Design a binder for these strands. Structure first.
Lengths: 264, 117, 122, 64
RNA sequence: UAUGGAAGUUUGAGGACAGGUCUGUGAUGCCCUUAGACGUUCUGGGCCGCACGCGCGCUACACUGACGGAGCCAGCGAGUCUAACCUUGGCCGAGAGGUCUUGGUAAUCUUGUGAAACUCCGUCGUGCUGGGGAUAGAGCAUUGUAAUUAUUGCUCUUCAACGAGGAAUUCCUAGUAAGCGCAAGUCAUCAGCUUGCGUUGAUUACGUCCCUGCCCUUUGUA
C-alpha cells in the first residue's frame, strides 16, 4: 500500500544525488530549504524537486518565501534502491508477491539474473493517517532492519541451516529465495521420524546459545528445514524461559497428531 | 459399432432431423428446441447443401466460414466441415457423425490456456 | 446369526450398523437409493446389518440390477437414458467408475469442450 | 448382547440410583444404539421408573 | 421529591462555500485538432480466464447435535391501463414445474403474507460419522433470440479438506450482541448484495488513560 513500484525509473541524473542532497543534511538539518540542496545549476535542483515534490519523494510546505523541506518516506525508498542497485542486486522486480503484514516479500532480480527475495521493513502496512512524518515510518523501521539483519547473519554464521541475509540498506533486507514449503500449509510427507528427530533436536540447536525459539510452532520453516520469522527469541537471562519450552515443543507435539500422525 | 444416437442408427440417423430427431434427445433439445425457429438457412442451408455437394469422390466437403456457435449439430450436417469463428479467424472444424447431441460452440475453443511452460 | 462386514460387488460393505447406511458405501448408490431399495426389499429399516442372510441379500441385489420392474418409476435411478442405447441404467460400484470415466473419452474423440479441458488441463 | 450381554447386562447394571441414555455408554457396554431400546424395555418391564418419558435426556431411577 | 412516575441520560433519536452547474441555458469572452486518421453498423469473443499474495463474506468441523413426523407464531412491505403484476382456488406430475378459472389498481384479494429458528416425540452415538456437501456426471425443467465457458430450479449418484484454528486484528453496553427468516431496490432468469422489518434472545464494565487515535493547555527558541 504505502510502497510503490511505479515511479522508480523516471527520475533523472541529479535526482538520485539531489534526493540524496536532502539526506546528508537530514541527520543535522531535519528541515531542508531549497538552496540547502544546491551546495551538496539553476535548472538542476527544482526539476528534481518538481519530480520529488510532485512524485512525492519530498514533502512540500507552501509559503511566499523559500520553502523548507523534510525528506519523505517515499524518498528514502528509491535512495535505498539506488544504493541497492549500486552494491549489486535488484535489476527488476518479480511477478510473485509476496505481500506480508509488516514486511514485503519481493521476488527480485539480482545481477546474473538471480530471482531472490527482497524484504522492505516498515510496520503496519496499508501509509497511515496517524503518523508524524520523517521518523516513525523511516527511522523506527530504519534501525530495526539492521537489528534483525545482523541477527540472522550472526545466527547463520552459527552454522545451523537457515536463510542467509544477502543485502541490507535503509530498511530493506534481501536474502535467498529459500524454496521449500511451510508446515503451516503442509500437504504430505512420508518420513517424520528423523524429520522430528531433527526438529526436537533443532530446538536444542535453537537452545545451543541458551535461547528458545518461541515461534517454533507452525507457519515457520520448510522442507529443504527452512525456518523464518526469527525475532521473537528468548534469552536464558530472560526470566520466564522455562515456561516457553513446553509451549514450543508441545505445540509441535500437537500438530503432527492431527496431520502427519506422529508422537515423541 | 456405429453411432447409436440414443438407440438410433444409420438411415434414421440421416433423416429424422428437426422433426423427431429433436424428440428423442435430452431436455435441452425437446421442448427447448420446440423453439429454435431462427434463420437456419442464413448462409447455412445453401452452403450446407452446396458445400457437402462440394465433396466429390472421397473428399472433405467445402469448409463453411460461418458466424454461429449456438446451433446444435443437425443430422443433415453429418460429415460436414465448418469453420467456427471464435473471436479470431474462421477456425475450421470437420463435422463427424458421432458429434450429434452437442453444440457447435463446444468444439471451437474461444480462450487459449494460461500456458505456464 | 450376527454377521459383520461383507465383501460382494467388490466392496467391503460394513456390518453392525443400520441397514440403509451399510449399502451407501458402495459407489453409485447412496442414502435415498439404499433407503428406497430397503423399502422395496420388504425388510424393516430399523433392522441392523448384523442380520440379512444370503437370500435377503439376493433379493436386494436382484432388485437393484433390474430396477424398473420392481416399481422404480425411472426418475429415481442415477444414470438414466444413456446416450449409447437409450435405456435406463443404474450404474454400480465399478460399472459407475469406468462408465463415468469413459464419458471423458467420448467427449475427447468428438473433440468436445470438456474433454479438451481435461486433456490440456492435466 | 453380541454374545451374552442381554442376560449379562440385565443382571449386571441396575447398580446406581440413575441410568440414562449416555450413562450406559460409560460402562463400556453397547452404545446408545440398542441400550436406548434396553431403556425402553426395562423402563417398560418394571425395573427402572420412568420419571422422564422422552428423548435426549431421560431421567430415570434404579430398580425400585 | 430510593420514592412515585408510561417516560427522571438534550424523555429519546434524527432532520456564506476557489462544492457543483460553459456537458442546464430558451444569457455572456478567449485558446486547441481536422478528410486512406470523422463516424454509423453487423456477427463472434471477452469482461468469469489462475502457481499466486492481499481483503470482504458464506458454510462447516455436530450429540446445547444431524435427520422424520407433528404445533403453528409476526412485522416491514408491494402488486396488472392502454395491459398481463401479485396470485387464491380446481386439477396434473416425485419434484421443478405445467394447465383451467377467479379476486385484487389494493386496510378488503394475494395475505391472517399460516416464514424460519423454535417446541414435542422418535432414530442416530461418537466413528472425516449420517457433520460437511467441495467438485463432477446423468436425466428432467424454466427464463430469455441465444445458458456452449457449466444462468437458475428439481431428482439420483460422486463425498474434498475441515477433529476448533499461530503471530495479528474486527465489532459490541439491553430487547442490544449473537442466532433466525421475511419484504423492498438492481432485475427476462440470477445474491452469497444492500436497506429496512420482525422472531428467539446473552455475557460482561458502567470506568480508565496501558496502548491506540483525536481534541485542548503550559513550555523553549528564529
Amino acid at each position: 500500500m504505502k510502497l510503490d513500484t511505479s515511479h522508480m525509473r523516471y527520475l533523472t541524473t541529479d535526482d538520485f544525488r539531489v534526493l540524496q542532497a536532502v539526506e546528508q543534511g537530514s541527520r543535522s538539518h531535519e528541515v531542508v530549504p531549497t538552496p540547502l540542496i544546491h551546495q551538496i545549476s539553476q535548472s538542476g535542483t527544482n526539476r528534481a524537486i518538481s519530480d520529488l515534490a510532485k512524485l512525492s519523494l519530498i514533502s512540500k510546505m507552501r509559503n511566499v518565501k523559500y520553502d523548507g523541506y523534510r525528506l519523505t518516506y517515499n524518498g528514502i525508498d528509491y535512495l535505498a534502491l539506488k544504493t541497492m542497485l549500486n552494491r549489486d542486486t535488484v535489476y527488476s522486480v518479480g511477478n510473485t508477491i509476496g505481500v506480508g503484514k509488516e514486511s514485503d516479500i519481493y521476488k527480485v532480480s539480482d545481477k546474473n539474473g538471480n530471482p531472490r527475495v527482497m524484504k522492505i521493513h516498515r510496520l503496519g502496512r496499508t501509509y497511515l493517517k496517524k503518523s508524524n512524518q520523517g521518523a516513525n515510518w523511516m527511522h523506527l523501521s530504519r534501525l530495526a532492519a539492521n537489528k534483525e539483519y545482523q541477527f540472522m547473519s550472526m545466527l547463520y554464521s552459527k552454522g545451523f541451516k537457515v536463510p542467509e541475509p544477502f543485502d541490507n540498506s535503509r530498511h530493506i533486507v534481501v536474502m535467498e529465495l529459500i524454496e521449500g514449503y511451510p508446515m503451516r500449509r503442509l500437504r504430505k510427507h512420508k518420513n517424520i521420524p528423523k524429520l522430528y528427530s531433527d526438529l526436537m533436536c533443532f530446538i536444542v540447536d535453537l537452545a545451543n546459545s541458551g535461547l528458545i525459539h518461541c515461534d517454533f510452532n507452525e507457519f515457520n520453516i520448510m522442507i529443504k528445514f527452512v525456518v523464518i520469522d526469527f525475532p521473537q527469541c528468548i534469552s536464558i537471562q530472560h526470566q520466564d524461559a522455562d515456561y516457553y519450552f513446553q509451549r514450543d515443543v508441545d505445540c509441535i507435539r500437537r500438530f503432527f497428531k492431527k496431520k502427519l500422525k506422529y508422537e515423541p | 459399432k456405429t453411432h447409436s444416437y440414443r438407440g438410433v442408427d444409420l438411415e434414421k440417423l440421416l433423416e429424422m432431423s428437426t422433426e423427431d430427431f429433436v424428440k428423442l434427445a435430452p431436455a435441452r433439445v425437446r421442448r427447448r428446441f420446440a423453439r429454435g425457429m431462427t434463420s437456419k438457412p442464413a448462409g447455412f442451408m445453401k452452403k450446407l447443401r452446396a458445400a457437402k455437394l462440394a465433396a466429390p469422390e472421397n473428399e472433405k466437403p467445402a469448409p463453411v466460414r460461418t458466424h454461429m456457435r449456438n446451433m446444435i449439430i443437425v443430422p443433415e450436417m453429418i460429415g460436414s466441415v465448418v469453420g467456427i469463428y471464435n473471436g479470431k479467424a474462421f477456425n475450421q472444424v470437420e463435422i463427424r457423425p458421432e458429434m450429434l447431441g452437442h453444440y457447435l460452440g463446444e468444439f471451437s475453443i474461444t480462450y487459449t490456456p494460461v500456458r505456464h511452460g | 446369526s450376527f454377521q459383520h462386514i461383507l465383501r460382494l460387488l467388490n466392496t467391503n460393505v460394513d456390518g453392525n450398523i443400520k441397514i440403509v447406511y451399510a449399502l451407501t458405501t458402495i459407489k453409485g448408490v447412496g442414502r435415498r437409493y439404499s433407503n428406497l431399495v430397503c423399502k422395496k426389499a420388504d425388510v424393516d429399516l430399523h433392522k441392523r446389518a448384523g442380520e440379512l442372510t444370503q437370500e435377503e441379500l439376493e433379493r436386494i441385489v436382484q432388485i437393484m440390477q433390474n430396477p424398473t420392474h420392481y416399481k422404480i418409476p425411472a426418475w429415481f435411478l442415477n444414470r438414466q437414458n444413456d446416450i449409447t442405447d437409450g435405456k435406463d441404467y443404474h450404474t454400480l460400484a465399478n460399472n459407475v467408475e469406468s462408465k463415468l470415466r469413459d464419458d471423458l473419452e467420448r467427449l475427447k474423440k468428438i473433440r468436445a469442450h470438456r474433454g479438451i479441458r481435461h486433456f490440456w488441463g492435466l | 448382547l453380541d454374545q451374552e450381554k442381554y442376560d449379562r447386562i440385565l443382571k449386571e447394571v441396575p447398580t446406581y440410583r440413575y441410568v440414562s441414555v449416555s450413562v450406559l455408554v460409560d460402562r463400556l457396554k453397547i452404545g446408545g444404539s440398542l441400550a436406548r431400546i434396553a431403556l425402553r424395555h426395562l423402563e417398560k418391564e418394571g425395573i427402572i421408573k420412568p420419571i422422564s418419558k422422552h428423548s435426549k435426556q431421560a431421567i430415570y431411577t434404579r430398580a425400585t
